Amino acid sequence: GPKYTMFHYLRAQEFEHGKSRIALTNSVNEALLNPSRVYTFFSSDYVKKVNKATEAAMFLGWVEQLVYDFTDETSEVSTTDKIADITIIIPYIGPALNIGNMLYKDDFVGALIFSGAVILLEFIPEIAIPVLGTFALVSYIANKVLTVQTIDNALSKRNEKWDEVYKYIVTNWLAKVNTQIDLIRKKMKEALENQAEATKAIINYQYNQYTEEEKNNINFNIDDLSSKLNESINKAMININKFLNQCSVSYLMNSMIPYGVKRLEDFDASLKDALLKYIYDNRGTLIGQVDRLKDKVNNTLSTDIPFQLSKYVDNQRLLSTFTEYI
Amino acid sequence: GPKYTMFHYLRAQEFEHGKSRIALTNSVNEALLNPSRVYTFFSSDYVKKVNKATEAAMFLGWVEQLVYDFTDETSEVSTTDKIADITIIIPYIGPALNIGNMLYKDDFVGALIFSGAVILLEFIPEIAIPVLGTFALVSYIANKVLTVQTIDNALSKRNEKWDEVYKYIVTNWLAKVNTQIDLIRKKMKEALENQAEATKAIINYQYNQYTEEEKNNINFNIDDLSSKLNESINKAMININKFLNQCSVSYLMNSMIPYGVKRLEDFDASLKDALLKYIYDNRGTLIGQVDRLKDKVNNTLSTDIPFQLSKYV
């Protein structure tokens, strides 16, 4: 069961602008407990290479290593939506349990790998499809054209239904799911903007802690560093946006829509039963075309209506972007 | 919500040896519904390369490429204990939710990152710390040496509990945790040599789809392939085992010992609460020392017994 919120994680990355030997750490707990400690999701190698005290000579080579590595920490990323979350249950009293019996979970939106750290995303709750309803099939004893008409209208309304549900799903995906993803977009840029300012204030300390002659005999410039980090960040944000787009579309296509389709297929099946029962109960009235109708019903209600994203998006620009990731 | 077992995931990776061309798949569920499909955690690019219809001419190069690839898929494996598992709540009714209030989970032992899949591990449950509340404080009437005795005994008994609980935790971490982790090593290596069996089955199906004078012109020995990826498999197990070792030792150091330390401090607290009430029910009988006792009490019961790994290993 749940215990922390994101605040836990985010506070760990925060610091106030108050000068001290502030260092990057790989422990959320340690960051949260020492105000001169800041949590990084970068590799320990980068941590050891940033917390390090460095003589004024090798100082400008230190910085250059960092900026390459920083770029290499924020841009070298990987992704997948293939994740096995395995919980192993240790019997402390009994005999050992069979690995078959251990717990397995793979229902994840996707995962962003940073060499130093893995970011996983899951979404809840599953979308709620409004109840689809039951077509009232009106009988007209001894009236072929009119009973045929209720069959035909039943099948048309059914198609409309697939359209309504799809439309419903897309509008919520745009209005509720993508809006949340956008806030994640913003938080990830922010996390990065903040990791840049951590590494920055760690350096500015070292250089604003040197013999005033070295401070002039070392060409140094904040805007120089405070730019090679932003372009580094924007470069990194290209992959992150790509990932988040992939998550958005994957969620629409592999979670939301299939859930809606399952519903519409049930609807189809019980409408199919109703219509076949209807046909049998009017088979006198409908003589000459019972088999035609029986088949038109079966064929129709056994072929799914494919989902066409382009029906429901009138931005085109948005359409172009999302279509890539299918 | 529902919990599921590893069973199906393991089954997904299984195939019967026949004569049909099995195909690797990145879909667990597709493999489970199809005898001809076997789940793999290698890159999708591996899946594509192995599932490829290959001509007799290009055969050997394709096998050799796969061996290299197989070695990269299994050796070029990264690891970490830094995982941020974030559940995003979607508000279907109302305004957007601040990311700050989404859920955050990070109690994993470690993560094994292959080119085509991430494997997260977590261990449950906490170890039961044996009942510490064992002794009661006997009220001796007007016997100062013997009330001071019970108090010195209680204090000397907690030092004993701390030790015994450390020993108990390390004991159960060798006999129970390290045992279950050694079954992880087993099922992992065994999975790797099922991926090796899969790929061999696929490559051997391809060799045995050619003409007889063609197969004669191709220096292919199914045995030297077997050795070649066993080499790769044993190679992979170095970093897998280093991982599990780091896993094993982190759980001891980061979960078990800290838990025991908490339940132990709970004990210490409860013991003062009862030692002082014992002093208030032993009014004055101890005076001339009341200070001296409470000081050595608080010196002792407000300070954890340092845990030293070397001692218990």
- Eight-state DSSP code of residue B25: E
Q: Does A32 touch chain B (CB under 8 A)?
A: no
The token pair at B226 is: 């077997």
Decide if A113 and B172 are in contact by the 8 Å CB cutoff.
Answer: no
Q: Which of residues 245-304 of A touch B (CB under 8 A)?
A: none
Q: What is the chain B residue with the closest CA to A169?
A: B92
Q: Side chain identity at B260, as an amino acid letter?
A: G
Is A90 in contact with B259 (CB distance < 8 Å)? Answer: no
Distances (CA, A) of B300 to B156, B268, B279, B297: 10, 9, 17, 5
Q: What is the chain A residue with the closest CA to B184?
A: A99
Q: Which of B86, B96, B122 sits opposite A121 (nearest CB)?
A: B86
Beta-carbon contacts of residue A159 (< 8 Å; ≥ 6 apart): A305
Q: Is the peptide bond before B258 cis (omega within 30 degrees of 0)?
A: no
Closest CA–CA distance from residue A31 to any residue of chain B (Å): 14
Taking each helix axis from N to C end, the angle separating B222-250 and B178-207, rounded to the nearest 10 degrees, works out to 160
Q: CA A29, CA A26: separation in Å to the nearest integer?
A: 9
- DSSP-based three-state secondary structure for B105: strand
H helices of B173-307, where? 178-207, 212-216, 222-250, 257-280, 290-301
Q: Report the helix count and the strand count for chain B, using DSSP H and E.
A: 11, 8
Please name which of B268, B270, B275, B266 lies closest in space to residue B300, comparing C-alpha atoms: B268
Q: What is the chain A residue with the closest CA to B93?
A: A176
Q: Which fold has domain B6-312?
A: Clostridium botulinum neurotoxin B, "coiled-coil" domain (1.20.1120)
Q: What is the CA radius of gyration of chain A?
A: 30
B110-113, long-range: CB < 8 A, 24+ apart: B110/B79, B110/B80, B110/B81, B110/B243, B110/B246, B110/B247, B110/B250, B111/A118, B111/B79, B111/B80, B111/B81, B111/B83, B112/B77, B112/B79, B112/B240, B112/B243, B113/A78, B113/A113, B113/A118, B113/B77, B113/B78, B113/B79, B113/B80
Given CA atoms A33, A36, A41, A47 in this order, what sign does their dihedral have?
negative
Torsion of CA A272, A275, A277, A280, to 10 degrees: -130
Q: Tell me the backbone φ, ψ of residue A253, rounded to 5 degrees.
A: -70, -35
Q: CA B117, CA B123: separation in Å to the nearest integer?
A: 20
H helices of chain A, where? 6-11, 28-33, 44-48, 59-74, 144-172, 178-207, 214-217, 222-228, 230-251, 257-281, 290-300, 317-324
- Method used for this model? X-ray
Torsion of CA B289, B292, B298, B300, to 10 degrees: -110
- Resolution limit in angstroms? 2.7
Decide if A91 and B172 are in contact by the 8 Å CB cutoff.
Answer: no
Q: CA B149, CA B145: separation in Å to the nearest integer?
A: 6
Q: Tell me the backbone φ, ψ of residue A124, rounded to 5 degrees.
A: -145, 160
For domain A6-324, give the CATH number: 1.20.1120.10
The token pair at B84 is: 């941020």
Given CA atoms B276, B278, B283, B287 in this order, what sign does their dihedral have?
negative
Q: Does B141 touch chain A (CB under 8 A)?
A: no
Please name which of A129, A107, A108 lies closest in space to residue A261, comparing C-alpha atoms: A129
Is A123 in contact with A177 (CB distance < 8 Å)? Answer: yes
- Eight-state DSSP code of residue A103: E
Q: CA A155, CA A267: separation in Å to the nearest integer?
A: 12
Taking each helix axis from N to C end, the angle separating A178-207 and A230-251, rounded to the nearest 10 degrees, works out to 160
- DSSP-based three-state secondary structure for A229: coil
Is A22 in contact with A200 (CB distance < 8 Å)? Answer: no
Q: C-alpha A48: how far from its chain's center?
A: 32
Please report the DSSP string for A301-323 in residue order. Answer: TTSPPPP-GGGT---SHHHHHHH
Label the pairing between strands A118-124 and B83-89: parallel
Per the listing, tokens 């070392």 go with: A218
Q: CA B37, CA B23: separation in Å to the nearest integer?
A: 5
The token pair at B164 is: 């015994």
Q: Does A194 touch chain B (CB under 8 A)?
A: no
Q: How many CB atoms lie within 10 A of CB B186?
A: 11
Q: Does B175 touch chain A (CB under 8 A)?
A: no
Task: Give 3-state DSSP helix, strand, coil % of chain B, rounded to 5.
Answer: 60, 10, 30
Q: CA B27, CA B24: separation in Å to the nearest integer?
A: 9
Distances (CA, A) of B268 to A222, B155, B274, B279, B300: 53, 9, 10, 16, 9
The token pair at A37 is: 């400690």
Q: Does A130 touch chain B (CB under 8 A)?
A: no
Q: Does A106 touch chain B (CB under 8 A)?
A: yes
